[PDB]
Every structure is written in structure tokens, then in C-alpha cells.
Design a protein around this ligand. Structure first.
Ligand code: DZK
Ligand code: ZN
Lengths: 262, 8
């Protein structure tokens, strides 16, 4: 029941919004998850690891180059926008809105969201393998050797770029090898980010979960911290809930969310 | 530190 949700929304002064893959999916971003999402022969799991990067950095950068480049045509959807406009509108009223996203595509920044926490990092940030420096980067192509590479067809031929010519650190002292500043399978989340999110979820008096459920990583790390404090939690996703069974608004975030946040 | 996906 929407009008009950809206009563909380009306009151709420510190709102946290946790966004999952569903919302990036609705803008047509590939997530490479479940059966169907392949890039060439492989799935996310195969390439998104420190093992794969150490063993074939040209292949992984090809994959990450592709994903960077498909974003030139995928745009924020109404869910992205309603969240950004909400943030802005409530900001002026001295209320507040934080976004905690597992997504790496910067669509929240591109819709105009500002207080965003990217817990899995970003396709358009690099980290130096040598000096560890994090730097924004939308350079297209990220480097010449990758130009028009990363093509997604199963029997595309590998680029096999020499590692010296892969993207490198700009401080010439260093010239270190860059990697996408994205959290890979079997790496740890940044501890400072988690400390901030903890802090934000403590202030929080209404919490939205969008394009994912409370039950699963990563929403499951946080939704308990808020729920235990008796704070309402609204899921907006495409997953059903059984006939018999805090708020859940079924259907697409693009359709469900803007009416809720107006 | 928190393993990503809880280490699936
Ligand atoms: C960890 O999540 C693996 C990384 S990030 C996955 C992901 C990114 C954007 C949208 C949905 C999922 C990876 O597979 O790149
Ligand atoms: Zn460096």
C-alpha cells in the first residue's frame, strides 16, 4: 500500500537508498550474470578476479573496455532520475538522501545524484597496480592499443595487447599498470566506505532497496542494521513475494519508483 | 574485510 509508504516519505529526514543491478539493467546495461549474460566464451565470474587479471590482463581490459564503451549509448532511466531529483528537492528542505549502490556504471552520477557511495567501485576509475592511486577516467578509448577492441562476439579474435601498452599510470616516476577500480570476486570491500555507510544507516529513518532484495548480498549487510532500529524498508524490484506475506512494490523501478518519490 | 558476495 503506497499511500502508507508516502506517509513515511513525507516525514523522513535521513533517507538511504540502496541500489542493485536491476536499475542498471533497466537502462540496458549488461550485467553478465545468470544464464544469457556472456561476453565471448565467458561470464563475469571468469574475468572479474585478480587471478584472471594476473593471468591475462589484455583479455580482462578488453572486457572492461567493452563495458566502458557500451555506456556511451545507455542512459539513466526514470528511477535514476527520480532518485536524483528527490535528493536535490529534499536537500533544499534540509532533509537528506544517500545512495549506496553496488553498480559500477556511474548512472547515478549521470542522473545528477551526488551523495552516492559506490561500494563495488567504478568502470570509470582506475587504480595503479604499482602506486595504488585512484583516478577518474572516461578517456574513450582508455588507451590507443584498445581502440575498437573488446568486441563481444564469441569467436572474435583476442587483441593480445602487450602489457606495456595497456593503460598505465600517468605519474612518469611510476608508469604502473592500471586496473579498473572495481571490486572483483574474492576481494574485500573498502573498509572506510563501509564505516561511512554504517554511519549513514544509523541516521537513516527510511530505507529503500531498488533493483535487488534485502535477502541477498549486499542489501543483507545493511537492511538488518536499519530494521533492528524499527525503521521502515521499501523494496522496489521485479521479484514476487508469496500471496500470504516491509513494503514491496513489484514491477520495474522505472515505473514503480517515480510515483513513490514525487 | 568483507569479502564480495560473502565469498559466494
Ligand atoms: C562484482 O560485483 C563483480 C563485478 S561488479 C558486477 C556488476 C556490475 C554492474 C552491474 C551488475 C553487476 C563485475 O562482474 O564486473
Ligand atoms: Zn602509479
Amino acid at each position: 500500500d503506497l499511500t502508507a509508504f508516502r506517509e513515511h516519505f513525507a516525514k523522513a529526514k535521513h533517507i538511504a537508498i540502496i541500489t542493485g543491478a536491476g536499475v542498471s539493467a533497466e537502462s540496458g546495461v549488461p550485467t553478465f550474470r545468470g544464464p544469457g549474460g556472456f561476453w565471448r566464451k565467458w561470464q563475469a565470474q571468469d574475468l572479474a578476479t585478480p587471478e584472471a587479471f594476473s593471468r591475462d590482463p589484455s583479455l580482462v581490459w578488453e572486457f572492461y573496455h567493452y563495458r566502458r564503451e557500451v555506456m556511451r549509448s545507455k542512459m539513466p532511466n526514470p528511477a535514476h532520475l527520480a532518485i536524483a531529483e528527490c535528493e536535490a528537492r529534499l536537500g533544499q528542505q534540509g532533509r537528506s538522501v544517500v545512495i549506496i549502490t553496488q553498480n559500477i556504471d556511474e548512472l547515478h552520477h549521470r542522473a545528477g545524484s551526488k551523495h552516492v557511495y559506490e561500494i563495488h567501485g567504478s568502470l570509470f576509475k582506475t587504480r595503479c597496480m604499482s602506486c595504488g592511486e585512484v583516478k577518474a577516467n572516461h578517456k574513450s578509448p582508455i588507451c590507443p592499443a584498445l581502440d575498437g577492441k573488446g568486441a563481444p562476439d564469441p569467436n572474435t579474435k583476442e587483441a593480445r595487447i602487450p602489457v606495456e601498452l595497456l593503460p598505465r599510470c600517468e605519474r612518469k616516476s611510476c608508469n604502473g599498470l592500471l586496473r579498473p577500480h572495481v571490486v572483483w570476486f574474492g576481494e574485500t570491500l573498502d573498509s572506510d566506505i563501509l564505516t561511512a555507510v554504517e554511519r549513514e544507516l544509523e541516521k537513516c529513518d527510511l530505507c529503500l532497496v531498488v533493483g535487488t532484495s534485502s535477502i541477498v548480498y549486499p542489501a543483507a549487510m545493511f537492511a538488518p542494521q536499519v530494521a533492528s532500529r524499527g525503521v521502515p524498508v521499501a523494496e522496489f524490484n521485479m521479484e514476487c513475494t508469496p500471496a500470504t506475506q516491509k513494503y514491496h512494490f513489484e514491477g520495474p523501478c522505472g515505473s514503480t519508483l517515480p510515483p513513490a518519490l514525487e | 574485510x568483507v569479502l564480495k558476495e560473502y565469498g559466494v
